[PDB]
Structure 1
């Protein structure tokens, strides 16, 4: 039940809501008030999802898929079988996610640490909220949302993509991908850097942070070092996801044409638009 050093941490207090009421554990798990909130939202939603599985008449999970109200319903409510169920399910997800964040807050307090983790998570929650809430609304129908199904959701991605041409040309999509790639690069390195110091050549003595710092300057002649790389990672991550939201929230709202074409602005600057040569003359 407890890790060998757990018990002196298992003190009372730190709850946001409801005092000592739900201040307790279950196995390793901490239960907030919000431990309870998230359970209830998760129960409900998983129920409604099965209820969809029935109106649809599959149980195979590769097939089950739960679409929004179609564009006619706009931002009104659909009949259950006609889009209501997704709308509730979406409400329930949100409830789950937010609650799961608040509980992370409540654990943070009991342990006496910073709130960086709940913090960073709220960007994921925010990315989801963009695709199923902020964009639909600004566009004008729940129908612009992606559907809850394993492959049907990849399908939304693909058609939505291909609606505006090759989606590569969405400029914030370019920014957002550069972080995804960069972050993975940095996670690759960081991990490798520590492991190689903690696990040196053989019967050789566990290297040091100074060795770590040294390895990089030798290699690429600078080292962000160890408060840095953790500050770096948190940032590249949060940024990737931040720009991911961006590129979608603008798509379909303030730009509805082909993304490649937006690049015409650059090429049509008047001090070269009319020159003859290159790819564009």
Structure 2
């Protein structure tokens, strides 16, 4: 049930809501008021999923699909079988997510640590809310949202993308990807650096963080340090997701033509627009 050093940390307090009521653990897990909230929202949203699956007439996860209301229902409420179920589920999902974040906050307090984790998580939540709430509302209907289905959500992504030609041309999407690739680069390096210092050549002593620093200064002539690469990581990852949200929120709202055509602006700047040759002349 406890790690050899856990007990001295399992002290009362830190709860946001409800005092000592739910201030306790279940095995390794911390409950807290929001422990309950998320359990409640999760049980519910799952039963509502099992329920859509019968209306669909399939017990196969590769087939189960919970679709949003159709483009005719606008931003009104749809019947259960015709999109209502997906709305309740979204409410439930969002409820689960937020609750899961606030529990993280409650654990943070009990342990006397920083709130950087619930904070970073909120970016993920904002991305999801962008795709099923912010965008559709701004667009004008709940069916612009993606379905809750393993493969169908992929269908939605492919179809939404192609609605604007090659989505690669979305400028914000370019920068968002750049961050995803860079973050993965930095994660591989960071992990590799620490391990190589902690696990040297055979028989040699554990390297020092001064070695790790040197190694990198030698390689590319600069070392960000141990508080630095951790600040870096948090940032790249949060940024990736921030730009992801932006590329979507603008797509279909303030730009609805082909993304590739938006680049005409650069090219149709008066100083070099009518000048011959090249590719665009």
TM over 0.5: yes
Aligned residue number for residue 196 of structure 2: 196
Aligned residue number for residue 57 of structure 2: 57
Aligned-pair distance for 1:32? 1.1
Aligned residue number for residue 228 of structure 2: 228
**Count of aligned positions:** 281
Aligned-pair distance for 1:248? 0.1
- Structure-1-length-normalised TM-score: 1.00
Aligned residue number for residue 215 of structure 2: 215
Matched, 1:88 2:84: no
- Is the partner of 2:30 in helix, strand or coil? strand
Aligned-pair distance for 1:265? 0.2
Structure 1 CA distance, aligned partners of 2:104 and 2:249? 28
- Is the partner of 2:44 in helix, strand or coil? helix
Aligned-pair distance for 1:124? 0.2
Structure 2 CA distance, aligned partners of 1:48 and 1:77? 16
Matched, 1:262 2:265: no
Aligned-pair distance for 1:267? 0.5
Aligned-pair distance for 1:201? 0.6
Aligned residue number for residue 127 of structure 1: 127
Aligned-pair distance for 1:7? 0.1
Structure 1 CA distance, aligned partners of 2:228 and 2:179? 17
Deviations 1:240-271 (A, max 9, x none): 00000000000000000000000000011111
**Which aligned runs of 4 or more in structure 1 are off by greater than 6 angstroms?**
none
Structure 2 CA distance, aligned partners of 1:262 and 1:3? 57
Aligned-pair distance for 1:42? 0.1
Aligned-pair distance for 1:174? 0.1
Deviations 1:168-206 (A, max 9, x none): 000000000000000000000000000000000111000
- Is the partner of 2:9 in helix, strand or coil? coil
- Is the partner of 2:25 in helix, strand or coil? strand
Deviations 1:60-88 (A, max 9, x none): 00000111000000000000000000000
Aligned-pair distance for 1:238? 0.1
Structure 1 CA distance, aligned partners of 2:185 and 2:147? 31
Structure 2 CA distance, aligned partners of 1:246 and 1:136? 14
Aligned-pair distance for 1:34? 0.1
- Is the partner of 1:222 in helix, strand or coil? coil
- Is the partner of 1:148 in helix, strand or coil? coil
Structure 2 CA distance, aligned partners of 1:132 and 1:199? 46
Aligned-pair distance for 1:48? 0.3
- Is the partner of 1:257 in helix, strand or coil? coil
Structure 2 CA distance, aligned partners of 1:20 and 1:245? 38
- Structure 2 residue ranges without an equivalent (≥5): none
- Is the partner of 2:227 in helix, strand or coil? helix
Deviations 1:208-238 (A, max 9, x none): 0100110001000001011000000000000
Structure 2 CA distance, aligned partners of 1:108 and 1:212? 31
Question: Counterparts of 1:1-281 in structure 2 under 5 Å?
Answer: 1-281=1-281
Structure 2 CA distance, aligned partners of 1:85 and 1:99? 21
Structure 1 CA distance, aligned partners of 2:214 and 2:272? 48
Aligned-pair distance for 1:15? 0.1
- Is the partner of 1:225 in helix, strand or coil? coil
- Structure-2-length-normalised TM-score: 1.00
Structure 2 CA distance, aligned partners of 1:126 and 1:244? 10
Structure 2 CA distance, aligned partners of 1:165 and 1:210? 50
